[PDB]
Design an enzyme around this catalytic site. Structure first.
Site, mmCIF file in Angstrom:
data_model
loop_
_atom_site.group_PDB
_atom_site.id
_atom_site.type_symbol
_atom_site.label_atom_id
_atom_site.label_comp_id
_atom_site.label_asym_id
_atom_site.label_seq_id
_atom_site.Cartn_x
_atom_site.Cartn_y
_atom_site.Cartn_z
ATOM 1 N N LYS B 35 0.761 -0.957 -0.082
ATOM 2 C CA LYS B 35 -0.139 0.172 -0.270
ATOM 3 C C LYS B 35 0.172 1.362 -0.116
ATOM 4 O O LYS B 35 0.524 1.799 -0.509
ATOM 5 C CB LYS B 35 -0.953 0.041 1.180
ATOM 6 N N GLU B 119 -4.261 8.392 7.880
ATOM 7 C CA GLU B 119 -4.749 8.745 6.194
ATOM 8 C C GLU B 119 -6.325 9.782 6.724
ATOM 9 O O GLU B 119 -6.646 9.682 8.313
ATOM 10 C CB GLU B 119 -5.572 7.559 5.710
ATOM 11 N N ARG B 211 -6.156 -9.142 -8.248
ATOM 12 C CA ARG B 211 -7.307 -10.434 -8.893
ATOM 13 C C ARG B 211 -8.276 -10.195 -9.276
ATOM 14 O O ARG B 211 -8.543 -9.180 -8.892
ATOM 15 C CB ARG B 211 -6.613 -10.952 -7.094
ATOM 16 N N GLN B 338 -52.965 -46.480 25.462
ATOM 17 C CA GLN B 338 -53.044 -46.408 27.387
ATOM 18 C C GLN B 338 -52.442 -47.187 27.736
ATOM 19 O O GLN B 338 -50.964 -47.272 28.549
ATOM 20 C CB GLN B 338 -53.954 -44.974 27.111
ATOM 21 N N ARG B 407 -59.918 -33.542 31.284
ATOM 22 C CA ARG B 407 -60.498 -33.293 32.391
ATOM 23 C C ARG B 407 -61.141 -32.287 32.579
ATOM 24 O O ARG B 407 -60.304 -31.360 31.838
ATOM 25 C CB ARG B 407 -58.644 -33.161 33.346
ATOM 26 N N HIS B 534 -68.335 -47.052 31.074
ATOM 27 C CA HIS B 534 -66.969 -47.082 30.762
ATOM 28 C C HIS B 534 -66.153 -47.859 31.821
ATOM 29 O O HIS B 534 -66.416 -47.603 32.624
ATOM 30 C CB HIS B 534 -66.282 -46.146 30.849
ATOM 31 N N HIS B 536 -62.693 -51.635 32.446
ATOM 32 C CA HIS B 536 -61.132 -52.460 32.095
ATOM 33 C C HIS B 536 -61.591 -53.885 32.417
ATOM 34 O O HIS B 536 -62.105 -53.838 32.827
ATOM 35 C CB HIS B 536 -60.155 -51.692 32.214
ATOM 36 N N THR B 671 -56.217 -40.852 37.108
ATOM 37 C CA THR B 671 -54.778 -40.006 36.898
ATOM 38 C C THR B 671 -55.385 -38.420 36.549
ATOM 39 O O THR B 671 -56.162 -37.716 36.210
ATOM 40 C CB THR B 671 -54.253 -39.971 34.874
HETATM 41 O O1 LIG Z 1 -44.011 -40.197 32.129
HETATM 42 C C1 LIG Z 1 -43.975 -39.977 32.525
HETATM 43 C C2 LIG Z 1 -45.510 -40.071 32.390
HETATM 44 C C3 LIG Z 1 -46.101 -40.439 30.865
HETATM 45 C C4 LIG Z 1 -47.198 -39.846 31.029
HETATM 46 C C5 LIG Z 1 -48.711 -41.238 32.260
HETATM 47 C C6 LIG Z 1 -50.246 -41.593 31.808
HETATM 48 S S1 LIG Z 1 -50.316 -39.705 32.461
HETATM 49 C C7 LIG Z 1 -52.327 -40.782 31.859
HETATM 50 C C8 LIG Z 1 -51.997 -41.596 32.326
HETATM 51 N N1 LIG Z 1 -52.202 -41.446 34.011
HETATM 52 C C9 LIG Z 1 -51.355 -42.187 34.754
HETATM 53 O O2 LIG Z 1 -51.447 -42.095 35.962
HETATM 54 N N2 LIG Z 1 -50.220 -42.617 33.994
HETATM 55 C C10 LIG Z 1 -50.871 -42.374 32.992
#
Ligand SMILES: O=CCCCC[C@@H]1SC[C@@H]2NC(=O)N[C@@H]21
Ligand SMILES: O=CCCCC[C@@H]1SC[C@@H]2NC(=O)N[C@@H]21
Lengths: 941, 941
Positions: B35, B119, B211, B338, B407, B534, B536, B671
């Site tokens: 330069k 400069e 270049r 489930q 729920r 319902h 089981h 649950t």
């Molecule tokens: O590993 C963590 C929990 C995974 C979900 C378990 C589900 S919640 C709906 C159902 N009721 C329960 O007590 N357990 C299952």
């Protein structure tokens, strides 16, 4: 594109949807997309078509009638097919049925319709096509024809507009016929009438592409007409004249080398299949390359070669005789490894140390670097050119005379050649930078030596006549090879004009007392002649023998680098230099330079551990004074004995070698006579024969081919003549050669051979290639095929050549000055359905993959055959070998001694002969069958 | 580029190698790359330069003198530097020393030389540069100046040719001065003289780029001069005039989607690291995909959804009540798995059978396919969107009502939400094609149920109020959950406007006698209301229980596909259909259709063998009448007990579950209340505590967070109230929630959350994403980051999702209709120096490679810490877990019950509290540290 203009149902579906199709009408697309309908329209327009069937053929019989009418070649084409699929050329009637069936199945699979038609195949056509443009008003403007002849498997690769060197009248015919065809159908878009133009300038219509082609762009660039704008405006209902488009306004405006892939293919081959060179011992090459000592920058000092080039052979011989002190010569370049590593040392390692040798050993008498086994071994096992090795070493060492071991009437080969081949070999060897020819014969047969001396002298080489030493001149009980025998042969060789007289002790038999007696007698007889003494250190007395020769007035002795000396090699260079220091025999070689030279060779020898004689022999052995086995033969005979299951009996083989030498007549033992004695010794031990039994049964036994060819006279006449009656019993009615075997051979036509090689391998055949093929035809052919596949293997380091790379290993390969390949091995795949593994490399930072072949992955065989030893009519295989030829069939009458088959094992055709008269009941073997020992060849009743 | 034209030693090395450098001479490259030298040459050529020092400054004092002479602003520049590095503007004297020192250090670090020059800083210059071309004959042609003023931190971003609105006289000065400068040095290539142009139209030379610049292209487009052709031809020795290049002839003329790679990255990740979903049992998925039964071509038959869409929820409820026979509903889509496979059934498998369900089961009351655990599990463990599953299933099944488990005050989440989140969730669920909302509370806490009923009803959904069943109404000794309790709650839910009344037996406790008594009492009280039952099949009596309900006047029963029924699942569909056939309760479902449906699900269940409850439970178990453990809780509690080393004690855990239920007050167990009892039961067994010991020590023990939050009131109020004094002992001074927990929460700002999500994830955020983040913030964030990395994993089949491909395995992945990926896994490499493996694939006939990360390859850890059980001051970790937070430091005074650290294990923050008053002597743990059970957290004195 995608051949969619073949279909019109899409063009119709656009019209039915109220959407304009930018192309020809659905009717024109249908008419032009059918090859039969388009062809009928071309004929009706007066446009020439290729001669062809008017309808799709329904039978092979119609293809036969067409072939009778128009002749071959013909082509099958799918009637409803595009893009080069479902097409087969037929050149002959034998091909017609197969190609029809394949074309039909391919058309059915690709297009859902197997219908074929036949055309005359136009050979070497130009593919010329004409751009057309039509409007809805019946105006048709053509555009200049393009050239689409650059094709791969009928696919366009490069397109040119206008067609290069096309006849203007042919251009006008092509463009006029395209415009006629387009007018006949009422064509309405940019389109391409395609033609084949034959070598006679006749054009033939083939097809019309109704879709703006990929190659429209070259037409736009030469006409300044945007075809896609024109297609859109025509679909708007504009006329070509309203677009300014009139025919009068349209003008025309203006073998690859694959070295890196072949090397990667070799490396991938070695990774999958193992070493390509047969490995005799389970030792691995060193992982470390040898350290090259530092070399001064500049030309090397003047040496004895500068005297030879200035003053000729006689000037050189006088300069040697007048030298104050002992001259040494380096055999490390050839003889040392031939003995220790069986001549496996590669051009790669020789070149690395060559500049150091040139600078520090400029006073050597010569360096022995080529002849002996190096010529065959370079091509056969190292897959490198021995001539290129000579040339490249001569460039790197300009100042030291190069020496070769030359057989007198056989050059470097294993059989006798016509004299013109031996002369031309010596000429081309001298042209390639060979300086000294050590001319010997395996029997000291003077007529063979004289031819080799004359050939080497006529080439302008230094003739060194070499007397092969056997026996003991200090032992008065050994009368055959007495001092008088050596003196008488020396007188004949001196009278024949030898420049230097050599004593070649190929086994290390020269005791210090015998050295003193022989060399002083030669010096007293020939005061002005240079005396050169060669020995081996097999006995561990070679240093003492060479010191005794030097004291007796030898001018030159053979030595090797210390790490390449001793045992079956030459005496140590460093030992001779140290022992002569400060005496009148001082060599003036600095010991530090010998150490640096030895350290390089110690590292380099570690790369050849797989071939090292120390796998079998830990030191020199004094039993050489009894067995007289030469250094290179000892190593080979042991490897052969181990390969034949005789390794535990090698002591019996050495005893049988003495017995075989005596039975053969106590001839000199050097290549090939040392092999002949070796083959007989192994044969005796394998069959449990003593000398007396082998001589008694000599009419009944099938001796090794080398022993038979010796007894016939194919190697010359032994001193004292052939052993009778033993020769007569072995040969029976077999032809005998009287005198010199090469003297009865017709001259070889080297120009006819050169032409055959050019026809087979191309225009790069050299005089060196012709001589290599003349001496070693099968080896040279295999070497050319191997190097054609795998490229320049001399560029690889010796470890990578022998074992290939490890996974994740990175390395450099210099192909030429400034062309380095950085290579990394990445992976090897599993076996594919084709019996191949994929090897992955990085090459200069880029992924490469090569498909290789793993025979080891899929290897199996079964051997039926056994010969009962007690059944004279059951002929067993006398050795493991491959069946080359079968001379008899079942039901043939055979006489006693008649040839039955030829086996090729251990690089030696062995003729298996009948032990009895009888009728061949059954043959159990086929051509190319591999047999084990005692496998049943055939039955005789 | 890369500022390599600054260097000439490369240009010289090309010349010295005999290779032509295509550029200026090494001397010109040197002169112009300096330069200071280039500036001196510009002054000598009469070209204006920026006012600046004649040499590099050696001191701050020279910068001071320059600043006095020329004024501020000034600029420091590296003398040997390019590309905008080592440059500092200085505006004042206070800045001079700091900026000099920084510019010097930056120049020294970047260029190896700290030399600076000063400069005058030109404020707001245009950066104008002139293309030059010279030949070896001294012809220099300039090309029009370009504008490179669009810069970021002195780097060119946008380049324009010619310069916009440049004065023609200034253009002529710029181009003339470039040609003068180039002539002065004998320049010989395409090159660029650079200038700064000030606001007053004065130009100043700065540098010459030797270049071919990046921006040469804009000069080619305006001049029709190919600069690279010209550079090559000049290096051939052609003159500019011979190229047609004369100054008088030169005129001025005028996010990518990566789905396939992301899927290959997932497949490569699974091949290197294993399954991304936690596998509870050492079972492998089936290698065979399930066979999909044949489906009719067309729309499915009209079903109960067509009535719901035409007549609304009350019209649907009347149609259900008026139906002759038993209606069934399919839990297979959600409840069945489930319970059996813990909700691991993927959208991929549900979609394959959905068209068959729509056609053959059009008379189902509803299909239960979403809510419960499916929402969290889809995002957390399957990495798929639960909303997309709903939408895609709704498109495939247009005619059957979709049902969810809701729920009441918590929607599908685990905590209470503000009411506006629950309302907006039900609205968006209905918009996405949810039809029936089964509203339940885990304690039958009416205020939570009423909110969920109001939210579902306000959305326009069918409100099904569900009473959770516990106890035995046929047992007169069980007074808490008597027939009168169920009847009284049913009256309140009917008064609240339920369309359908559900009895939810979540454990399988309804005996046939209890079914008859409860269902007949409900039917007698509510003759016009639809009754849905319902259960089981956990007890193995569920089929008999549902038949008893149907006979007692239930309108609907829950069933599963036969291969997805029994054990902890619903009763068998095929069993109910077969048992009701030809009775007044006939379901009219053809048995053959049930078999084909079951066969699909038998194959599909084989893909989930790694999650199957049959790994731990071989049949239904009647001990459910004692333990009252719900189906999904049984499977989870067993997997948790095994993970904690309590698997051999699972019988003790079941006994402790009964004791924990009683201690907690015998609340309904579904649950999340079933988990709260489960956590307490495991805690009791882990600590060797009986009920009486746990109640006695309730002030000293650190209970599970779920038990504490329950006792605080965060899930609602249990029937009969909380157990006292046990609650008061556990909670101490911890805050208590009175009434409904969501009623005290401020409304969530969903628009603020949407904006946060758009800022984090881009403009593709949907209302479904906002609600997913509102309910499950950490899960949704992890799901978005995971799918951003790995793409649409719902496209993979379930085996490839869980285990990845085998080496040489080939498979298809449909991304969209007509977009199939053909994928083959080829190889996995060794570990590289970056801790990554390279995985090789073929994708649509092409090699692909992906770099992946193998934590398993490099995994190690060490745990120091142990707490002596007998030393009250040594606080051990109460469970294996990760340290989330540390609340205390060494030297801190702590009270009894004070929080010490927070552990996060098994998806539950556990606060570790002080057992004594004292001073923290030492803390042994860090944030994010993983602890085992009893690892020493801290010491208290
Ligand atoms: O590993 C963590 C929990 C995974 C979900 C378990 C589900 S919640 C709906 C159902 N009721 C329960 O007590 N357990 C299952
Ligand atoms: O394996 C086949 C033979 C390879 C060459 C052996 C050489 S020929 C020169 C020397 N003399 C011998 O008898 N053997 C070696």
């Amino acid at each position: 594109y995608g051949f969619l203009s073949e279909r019109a149902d899409f063009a119709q579906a656009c019209q039915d949807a109220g959407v304009r199709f930018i192309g020809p009408s659905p009717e024109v697309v249908r008419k032009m997309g059918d090859k039969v309908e388009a062809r009928a329209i071309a004929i009706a327009a007066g446009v020439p078509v290729v001669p062809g069937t008017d309808a799709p053929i329904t039978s092979l019989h119609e293809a036969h009638e067409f072939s009778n009418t128009y002749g071959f070649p013909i082509i099958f084409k799918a009637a409803y097919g595009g893009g080069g699929r479902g097409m087969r050329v037929v050149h002959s009637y034998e091909e017609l049925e197969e190609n029809y069936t394949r074309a039909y199945s391919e058309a059915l699979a690709a297009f859902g319709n197997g219908a074929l038609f036949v055309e005359k195949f136009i050979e070497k056509p130009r593919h010329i096509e004409v751009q057309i443009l039509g409007d809805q008003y019946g105006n048709i403007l053509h555009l200049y024809e393009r050239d689409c002849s650059i094709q791969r498997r009928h696919q366009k690769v490069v397109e040119i507009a206008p067609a290069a060197h096309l006849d203007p009248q042919l251009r006008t015919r092509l463009t006029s016929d395209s415009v006629k065809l387009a007018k006949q159908v009422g064509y309405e878009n940019a389109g391409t009438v395609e033609f084949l133009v034959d070598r006679h300038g006749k054009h033939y219509f083939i097809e019309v592409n109704s879709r703006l082609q990929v190659e429209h762009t070259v037409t736009e660039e030469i006409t300044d007409v945007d075809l896609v704008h024109a297609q859109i405006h025509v679909a708007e209902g504009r006329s070509l004249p309203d677009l300014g488009l009139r025919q009068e306004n349209i003008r025309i405006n203006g073998p690859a080398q694959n070295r890196a892939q072949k090397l990667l293919h070799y490396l991938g081959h070695v990774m999958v299949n193992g070493p390509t060179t047969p490995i005799p011992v389970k030792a691995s090459p060193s992982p470390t390359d040898p350290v090259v000592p530092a070399v001064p920058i500049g030309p090397p000092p003047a040496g004895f070669r500068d005297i030879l080039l200035r003053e000729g052979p006689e000037g050189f011989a006088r300069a040697v005789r007048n030298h104050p002190g002992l001259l040494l010569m380096d055999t490390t370049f050839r003889d040392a490894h031939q003995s220790l590593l069986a001549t496996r040392v590669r051009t790669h390692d020789l070149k690395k140390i060559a500049p150091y040798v040139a600078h520090n050993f400029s006073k050597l008498f010569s360096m022995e670097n080529w002849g002996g086994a190096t010529f065959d071994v370079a091509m056969r096992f190292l897959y490198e050119c021995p001539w290129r090795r000579l040339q490249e070493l001569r460039e790197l060492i300009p100042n030291i005379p190069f020496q070769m071991l030359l057989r007198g009437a056989n050059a470097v080969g294993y059989t006798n050649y016509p004299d013109n081949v031996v002369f031309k070999f010596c000429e081309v060897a001298k042209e390639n930078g060979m300086d000294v020819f050590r001319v010997f014969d395996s029997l000291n047969y003077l007529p063979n030596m004289l031819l080799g001396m004359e050939a080497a002298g006529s080439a302008g080489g230094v003739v060194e006549a070499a007397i092969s030493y056997t026996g003991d001149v200090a032992d008065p009980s050994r009368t055959k090879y007495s001092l008088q025998y050596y003196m008488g042969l020396a007188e004949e060789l001196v009278r024949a004009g030898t420049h230097i007289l050599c004593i070649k002790d190929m086994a290390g038999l020269l005791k210090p007392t015998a050295c003193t007696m022989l060399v002083s007698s030669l010096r007293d007889r020939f005061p002005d002649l240079p005396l050169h003494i060669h020995t081996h250190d097999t006995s561990g007395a070679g240093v003492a023998a060479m010191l005794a020769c030097a004291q007796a007035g030898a001018d030159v002795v053979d030595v090797a680098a210390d790490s390449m000396s001793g045992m079956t090699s030459q005496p140590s260079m460093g030992a001779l230099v140290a022992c002569t220091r400060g005496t009148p025999l001082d060599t003036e070689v600095p010991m530090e330079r010998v150490f640096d030279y030895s350290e390089y060779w110690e590292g380099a020898r570690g790369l050849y551990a797989a071939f090292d004689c120390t796998a079998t022999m830990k030191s020199g052995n004094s039993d050489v004074y009894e067995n007289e086995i030469p250094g290179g033969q000892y190593t080979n005979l042991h490897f052969q004995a181990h390969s034949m299951g005789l390794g535990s009996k090698f002591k019996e083989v050495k005893k049988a070698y003495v017995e075989a030498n005596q039975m053969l007549g106590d001839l000199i033992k050097v290549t090939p006579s040392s092999k002949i004695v070796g083959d007989l010794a192994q044969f005796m031990v394998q069959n449990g024969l003593s000398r007396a039994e082998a001589e008694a049964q000599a009419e009944e036994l099938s001796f090794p081919r080398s022993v038979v060819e010796f007894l016939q006279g194919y190697i010359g006449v032994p001193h004292g003549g052939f052993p009778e009656p033993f020769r007569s019993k072995v040969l029976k009615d077999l032809p005998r050669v009287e005198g010199r075997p090469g003297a009865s051979l017709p001259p070889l036509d080297l120009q006819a051979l050169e032409k055959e090689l050019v026809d087979r391998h191309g225009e790069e055949v050299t005089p060196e290639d012709v001589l290599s093929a003349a001496m070693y035809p099968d080896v040279f052919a295999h070497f050319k095929d191997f190097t054609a596949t795998f490229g320049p293997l001399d560029s690889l380091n010796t470890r990578l050549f022998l074992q290939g790379p490890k996974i994740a290993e990175e390395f450099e390969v210099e192909l030429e000055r400034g062309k380095t390949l950085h290579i990394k091995a990445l992976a090897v795949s599993d076996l594919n359905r084709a019996g191949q593994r994929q090897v992955f490399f990085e090459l200069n930072g880029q992924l490469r993959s090569i498909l290789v072949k793993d025979t080891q992955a899929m290897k199996e065989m079964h051997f039926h055959p056994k010969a009962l030893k007690d059944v004279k009519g059951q002929i067993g295989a006398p050795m493991p070998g491959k069946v080359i030829d079968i001379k008899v069939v079942a039901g043939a009458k055979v006489a006693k001694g008649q040839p039955l088959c030829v086996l090729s094992a251990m690089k030696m055709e062995t003729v298996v002969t009948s032990p009895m008269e009888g009728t061949v009941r059954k043959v159990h073997v086929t051509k190319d069958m591999t047999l084990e020992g005692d496998d049943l060849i055939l039955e005789i009743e």
